[PDB]
Amino acid sequence: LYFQSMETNPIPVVTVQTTPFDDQKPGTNGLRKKTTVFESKKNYLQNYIQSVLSSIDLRDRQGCTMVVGSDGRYFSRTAIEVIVQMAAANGIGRLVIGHNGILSTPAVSCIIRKIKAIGGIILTASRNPGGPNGDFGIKFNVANGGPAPDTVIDKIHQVSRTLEEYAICPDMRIDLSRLGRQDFDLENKFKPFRVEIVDSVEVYLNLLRGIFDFNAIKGLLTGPDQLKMRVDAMSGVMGPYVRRILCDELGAPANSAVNCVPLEDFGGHYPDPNLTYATGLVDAMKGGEFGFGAAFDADGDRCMILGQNAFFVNPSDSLAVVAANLSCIPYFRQVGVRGFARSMPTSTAIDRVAKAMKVAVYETPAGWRFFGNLMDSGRCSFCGEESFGMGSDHIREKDGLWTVLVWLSIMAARKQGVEDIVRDHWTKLGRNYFCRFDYEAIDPRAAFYLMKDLEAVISDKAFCSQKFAVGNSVYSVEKADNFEYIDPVDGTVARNQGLRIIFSESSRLIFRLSGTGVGVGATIRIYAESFERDPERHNREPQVVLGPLIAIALKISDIHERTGRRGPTVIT
Ligand SMILES: O=P(O)(O)O[C@H]1O[C@H](CO)[C@@H](O)[C@H](O)[C@H]1O
Ligand SMILES: [Ca+2]
Ligand code: NA
Ligand code: NA
Ligand code: NA
Ligand code: NA
Ligand code: NA
Ligand code: NI
């Protein structure tokens, strides 16, 4: 098929010889390194961008569209520039980029799916700190808008470890500050290379408007009896989303929007929503003047929900509560509820809802990528993780602001505050007490032998006959395993996904090695769960209830001696 056209000042395409790197395999949620690795290690960033681009069939990449966005952290604008120069050189037809480089992770997923893009690159290190001395990360999402599957992660890795050259258009300059279209004539490309700078919020907001009853939510946030609300974006990507959606569209006063200017260092604070790091929000909620509080992580897919007086909504309870109240949402009234999913370490509170509702519930490895197949196949429409994550099949990522809007929708439909809804839920279904200990940046050698030895302990043929006593508490082993998951849709097998001990007395211990590290150090997470049926025992301190289970965990793992630590780095 023949065509003729004109070109003006075509941008040359440069081929650069390079040496492969050894460690360019992404973890659970992207390739995460210290920022200085991407910024200063020669060709480190270019090698990985080329490897990502090369995991796309050359015929499927010619004339395709990719979405690019960042959480705003230091080095994002430089990475975006390089990404645009390299996408142009590798024959990508069009890039859709958020205004000023800003696109939340839920917005990227939404836009990929909406415009049928082949995929997306999200520049974020999630809850990790930003700045020149901070962390930087590169996520790759595929055509369903969800994280890259193990199939694609391996293709990226084998391209990165053997890469010998990459292509780039170094003379290209892109203005992220102006909305609209920018076309570029490239040498040896017939069609112009197209860049669209899009409003960070508009298309994502349009999706949310069809899921939720915005009139109902607006009624809750306005008028004389209005909900008093504090929403902390932690100086990350969610700033403009909060202001445009919760304030402008839904009527919340401007003082509801806290830390809603994106900053390259997130204001010098960890953009991590929990009681340990969202101290500014907790302190304001403790004052008693607000009925609802929320904090988001850097890229807007995590959310902590607080009630009046900083009542803490455990993320595993958030999952169960919302699951039991999906009828309050227009979306789920129309399309129904096909199934639930949680990660294996997440508490089994949602399983009790699924049983009562006669709905399937799946148990996946940690990480949102495993919910993608469940949603695509229609097996599941609502899912969550203990790590402050919740989402639905509206996209293929977790979604913090969606979590806020579904909670407000439930509060409006039930005419109840946060704490009353949760306690009413506990009264109906019982309470699953739950906590997580993080042992951060421990020696990888120590972690290896710890997990190896513990696996041998819990896999011994006599372990299911064991029982443990701490004080007056007794726990009897029902089952134990090294969790594996065979994807029911595409057959991907994920092994070594957590050491799990299930006790007969409605209790669990889970041990996992982290897969989202940046540097050398390893992180071990211990999860403890205990179910309480008695409604008079639903106001105890979780660290008291779970004390004995934690004692057993620390003893059989020997973690304190093996790591030199006296206790966990973080408690959730
Ligand atoms: O470091 P980990 O435990 O492998 O992974 C952690 O971050 C992931 C990416 O946000 C979450 O999906 C997990 O639930 C969380 O535990
Ligand atoms: Ca037993
Ligand atoms: Na040209
Ligand atoms: Na700083
Ligand atoms: Na079902
Ligand atoms: Na109430
Ligand atoms: Na993480
Ligand atoms: Ni995140």
Numbering used by the authors: -5 to -1, 1 to 567
Give the authors' words.
We here present crystal structures of herring PGM5, the first structures of this protein from any species. PGM5 shows a bi-lobed structure with four domains arranged around a common active site, forming a deep cleft between domains I–II (residues 1–195 and 196–308) and domains III–IV (residues 309–425 and 426–567).
To this end, crystals of bPGM5 were soaked with the PGM reaction intermediate G16P, and the structure was solved at 1.95 Å resolution. The structure contains all 567 residues plus five residues from the N-terminal His6-tag. Residues Arg507, Ser509, Thr511, and Arg520 from loop 4 binds the phosphate group of the ligand in a network of hydrogen bonds and forms a lid over the active site, interacting by van der Waals forces to Thr23 of loop 0. Lys393 is hydrogen-bonding to O6 of G1P, and both Lys393 and Arg27, the proposed general acid, are within 3 Å of the phosphate group of the activated serine. The active-site metal is modelled as Ni2+ and has similar characteristics as in apo bPGM5.
